[PDB]
Every structure is written in structure tokens, then in C-alpha cells.
């Protein structure tokens, strides 16, 4: 629901992703930017998204492109 003038992604996460893909398979990416959009060059990486207390590991697939990172890290515990 952001305008159609381009998606948003935090710059530090962008540079982390480029350094991770250019250097081959790496460790999970620890990030707090739940608001960043999942881009096609992140397919294959597992980003550890902060959820408030932990960094939830999220293995990115082609079906996730377009979502925000926080959509795969629930912040509230309910049983």
C-alpha cells in the first residue's frame, strides 16, 4: 500500500544482502528492519528478523517476494 514509486528497504540490510550474495552462502542475517521489503535477490538467504526479543530465522523463498520482513516474525505470544 506504499505508493508505486518504488518499494522500501533499509540501506544497511541492502548492503548486507549484496555482501552475502556476492560472497556465497553465509550465516543467517541478523536484522531489526522488519519494515524492509523482500527483494528477489534475497531468495535463498535466511534472514533472522527481530520480533521484539529474539531474531526469528526466516528462510526466504520466491513466494515471499513483495512481503515485509516482519510478516514472518510474530510479535505476540498466544496459546
Amino acid at each position: 500500500r506504499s505508493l508505486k514509486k518504488g518499494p522500501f528497504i533499509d540501506l544497511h540490510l541492502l548492503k548486507k544482502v549484496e555482501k552475502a550474495v556476492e560472497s556465497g552462502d553465509k550465516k543467517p542475517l541478523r536484522t531489526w528492519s522488519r519494515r524492509s521489503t523482500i527483494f528477489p535477490n534475497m531468495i535463498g538467504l535466511t534472514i533472522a528478523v527481530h520480533n521484539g526479543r529474539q531474531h526469528v530465522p526466516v528462510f526466504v523463498t520466491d513466494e515471499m517476494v513483495g512481503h515485509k520482513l516482519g510478516e514472518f516474525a510474530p510479535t505476540r505470544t498466544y496459546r
Partner: protein, 100 residues
Amino acid sequence: AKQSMKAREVKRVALADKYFAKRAELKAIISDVNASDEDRWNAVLKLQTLPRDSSPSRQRNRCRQTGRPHGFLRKFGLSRIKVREAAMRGEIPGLKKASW
């Protein structure tokens, strides 16, 4: 309010005067113009490298005397309580109790 809250507001006002007065206006102009560089204006990434407190939307209007963040009035720059205190003492020009 605490002293740290007032200091935060002061710092935010200062940062908003420093950066967002010219630099961020320029960047948001580059971001909103449809005629310019629909591919790599690079303005969107540069807008987030600026401090967050430089955004004027992060400022909260507080009473100029107590720092209260609720019940603010832009006409007087005071919260409702201090507005009433100054009004009853005759320190706000022209302001008086209304009836109709």
C-alpha cells in the same frame, strides 16, 4: 514532563532545523518528481541516512511551561491547565470567559 523529555524535544527541533529545512526537502523533491530519473535517483536511500529526529513529524507539541504532551493548544503554546491559569490571571490578552 521529565528533563530528558524536554531535552529530547529541543534536540529534535534543532535537528529538524538543521537538516530537513533544505536537504530533506531536496531529497523528497527528487523522490516525488515523476519526470526525474525513474530508475536510480538514489534519493530514497539518502533520505534514511539522515537522522530520524531531523524529521519534523517526530516532534511533539508540549506545553512551553510544563512540557505536558496532551491537551495542547497551538494558539497559546500551552496545555489546557496552564492556559486556564494564565487566562484567569489576566495574562492572555483579549481572552475571557465566553457565553452565548
